[PDB]
A paper describes a structure:
Based upon the high resolution crystal structure of [name], we found that [name] belongs to the TetR transcription regulator protein family. VAST search indicated that [name] belongs to the TetR-family transcription regulators. TetR proteins function as a dimer to bind their DNA elements. Our results demonstrated that [name] exists as a dimer in solution; and crystal structure also confirmed that [name] is a dimer at structural level. Our structural study indicated that the structures of both [name] and MAM are completely helical, although [name] displays a different folding pattern. We speculate that the distinct folding patterns might yield differences in molecular contacts that could account for the divergent MHC fine specificities of these two SAgs. The distinct structure of [name] relative to other SAgs suggests that it represents a novel family of SAg.
Numbering used by the authors:
A (entry chain A), B (entry chain A): 11 to 198
Amino acid sequence: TDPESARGKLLQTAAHLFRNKGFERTTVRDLASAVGIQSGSIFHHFKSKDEILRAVMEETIHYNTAMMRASLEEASTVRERVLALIRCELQSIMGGSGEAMAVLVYEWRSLSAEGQAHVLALRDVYEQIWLQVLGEAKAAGYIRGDVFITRRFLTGALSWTTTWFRAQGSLTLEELAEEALLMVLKSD
Amino acid sequence: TDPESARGKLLQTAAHLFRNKGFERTTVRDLASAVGIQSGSIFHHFKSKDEILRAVMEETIHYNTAMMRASLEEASTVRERVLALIRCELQSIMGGSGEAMAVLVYEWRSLSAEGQAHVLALRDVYEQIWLQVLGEAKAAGYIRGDVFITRRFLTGALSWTTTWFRAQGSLTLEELAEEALLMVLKSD
Ligand SMILES: [Mg+2]
Ligand SMILES: [Mg+2]
């Protein structure tokens, strides 16, 4: 969405308030004061506060995915396409994608069933990009195992990096992504 | 420890009470009634209730590790030794190792710093078995990447299986372990 539209100002500013204070502690008053409007005008753009949270999360995933596809477009070989997705995912895991991603992770349980189903639809599209690229890898002979299960293991291996990557000290994210590629591909 | 010794009866029975009710809700009275003793006699064997929790967790790890080493002893090839550790870890992740493992995972924050350092010492030994076996694999030419980082990714990939393995329906744990082996080894 458009950052200068009042919708965009509201979404982008809500992302910070939610990240800083929590969704539950962020009042409708808080958001209106931050955007320089009155409480009651918030609800000209979203049907509910729950819907603002849904849109913050949708925006983050739309952005991560757009970034992924753009990186893929610049990659012409199997090894570079797999590496592009690994790097994008790691960058998202390590606080790239910013406040609105941190909101997705910690405020997940604040979102309505209906909001959640919308955000999960976007996650489905994100996963299909992974499955396309890993399916290409499998077809070219770079992946030994089942494509869907390979993605499930890689999901866990990359996510877990939050528990240890900072403790390492001298390993960069690019080196981490390269090591992930060495694990998942038979050759690169 | 010895299951028929009063120490063993206490530890093995505490493992259930802690798993069923939580450590915090398990009173000294509860444990004494379950073992058929008086509250005050519990503390002839352990210095504290915190120490009973430490010993439940230590026993589980000692047992998992003993099982690991035994499986390794029956494996004569690199592929079977790596698979043995993957299978043992998965079996532990999926509710093998039983009540005392579930206690380790959920009651971790109830354990004292001193108890924790003891349990972490056992985890160190467990990890060194993984590093030995993966180091053998690397030496024989089966692993492309860094041994320590390969173990960190595999830790995350196996742990994450709790979030999805039941939803699959028809995949067995042995098949899951085989798929993990296909990912981590260049050949098997
Ligand atoms: Mg901003
Ligand atoms: Mg028992």
